[PDB]
């Protein structure tokens, strides 16, 4: 009514070590058949004498919610306040999570993912170097607009599309706390796919790979009415923080360095690094 008792007063720990003494039996825990595709459930008490240890360690920091739940930079680009080239004055980004290596490797440890998304923007501006820099420009305001697939796309900073009568936009002024908002799980499927071993056409032709399922739309950003006498360059950095996460069918982590944003493509890389012989255990 007023207060509610969702208290988790009983939290999970790591397994205790049971005291274990000598044995002489036909029962043999240490011998198994790896061939079954089974990982052994052996513990020290099975193969040696152990003392009792009340273990209070907890796996709290390794839940998928926690592992994925930190904001990571997924994109960055610059847009000028004034320039002769129309395209240098605004950013148009096709939303995806494959261009920044760190976030990509983490998400890619799972095949399917389902989560809500917290998006934070970090926008900074700097005056371009030049011969004459004296000016007195008022504070800048930026507009970030999300255009769902199929909506009208802006062709220049001053076009009608920026009216956002229906698309969601954020107007933010410099000097303030970074802009932020939440987006729910928006896939047309039941989970987001990090990989897709298939084609776009029924023919088994067309696009191949996860890129065929990426149609989340674009993010467009411009200065509001910020034309300055001497150019100023703003850089926008977008951060993603998944929350209320669920993950399915885990995969080996990416070993080879990434080469392309929209394909699994790689260059063969060795299993691991080498040492002189199979018995080398020293450093020098």
């Amino acid at each position: 009514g007023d207060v509610e008792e969702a208290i988790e007063r009983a939290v999970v720990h790591v397994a205790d070590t049971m005291r274990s003494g000598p044995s002489n039996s036909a029962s043999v825990p240490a011998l198994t058949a790896v061939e079954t595709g089974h990982t052994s459930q052996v513990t020290p008490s099975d193969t040696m004498q152990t003392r009792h240890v009340k273990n209070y360690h907890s796996r709290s920091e390794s839940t998928v919610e926690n592992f994925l739940g930190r904001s990571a930079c997924v994109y960055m680009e610059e847009y000028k306040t004034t320039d002769n080239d129309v395209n240098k004055k605004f950013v148009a980004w096709p939303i995806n999570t494959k261009q920044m290596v760190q976030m990509r490797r983490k998400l890619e440890m799972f095949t399917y993912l389902r989560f809500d998304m917290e998006v934070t923007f970090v926008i900074t501006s700097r005056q371009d170097p030049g011969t004459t820099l004296a000016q007195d420009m008022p504070v800048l305001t930026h507009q970030i607009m999300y255009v769902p697939p199929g909506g009208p796309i802006p062709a220049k900073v001053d076009d009608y599309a920026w009216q956002t009568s229906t698309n969601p936009s954020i107007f933010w002024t410099e000097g303030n706390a970074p802009a932020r908002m939440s987006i729910p799980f928006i896939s047309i499927g039941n989970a987001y796919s990090n990989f897709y071993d298939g084609w776009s056409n029924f023919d088994q032709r067309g696009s191949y790979g996860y890129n065929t399922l990426n149609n989340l739309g674009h993010i467009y950003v411009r200065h509001v009415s910020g034309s300055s006498p001497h150019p100023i360059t703003s850089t926008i950095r977008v951060y993603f923080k998944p929350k209320h996460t669920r993950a399915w069918v885990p995969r080996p982590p990416r070993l080879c360095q990434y080469k392309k944003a929209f394909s699994v493509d790689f260059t063969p890389t060795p299993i691991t690094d080498t040492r002189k012989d199979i018995n080398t255990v020293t450093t020098v």
């Binding site: 790591v14 397994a15 205790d16 070590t17 043999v28 825990p29 240490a30 011998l31 198994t32 058949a33 790896v34 061939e35 990982t39 052994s40 459930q41 052996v42 513990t43 020290p44 099975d46 193969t47 040696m48 152990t50 273990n55 360690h57 907890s58 796996r59 920091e61 390794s62 926690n66 592992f67 930190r70 994109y75 960055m76 261009q99 920044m100 290596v101 760190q102 490797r105 983490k106 080996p252 982590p253 990416r254 070993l255 360095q257 990434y258 080469k259 392309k260 944003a261 929209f262 060795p270 299993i271 691991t272 690094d273 080498t274 040492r275 199979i278 018995n279 080398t280 255990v281 020293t282």
Partner: protein, 178 residues
Amino acid sequence: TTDQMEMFRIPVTINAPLQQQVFGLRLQPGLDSVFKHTLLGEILNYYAHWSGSMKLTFVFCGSAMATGKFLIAYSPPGANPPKTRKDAMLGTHIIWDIGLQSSCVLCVPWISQTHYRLVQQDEYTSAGYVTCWYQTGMIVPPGTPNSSSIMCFASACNDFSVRMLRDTPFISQDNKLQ
């Protein structure tokens, strides 16, 4: 190494000198090249602290007709690693006999002064060595290959946990992709 797949094959042969060493490795699951890229090592590399026991499963892949006994041991840290089977047998070990059950599990216990060790392991946080020796020898009847391979699997036990989330040293970039 000529062929990459050879890295997974531990050589074992007939008429090996008595008490010969099969292999030796140092226990730094997140740092040593032998472990750093395994499932366990990859997970460890997103953290800075670790604690718990480990399972090293060995599977004999020779013919059903070959026989052999091996001594697999774990030596808690000290100034010097074991150089002889006599040295090794004083620590935690198991004597593996080959038969119908092809695999054997050496469970390396958590023996440490601190509750947690660093993934970026150092001397203070030293964990020791795991070594393998011929207990008897690999004997073979007529008409079977002269040498065979042993494989090693690794995983964490139920008392294992990691702490302190951090970025991994294993992935990087100089430019945005595209």
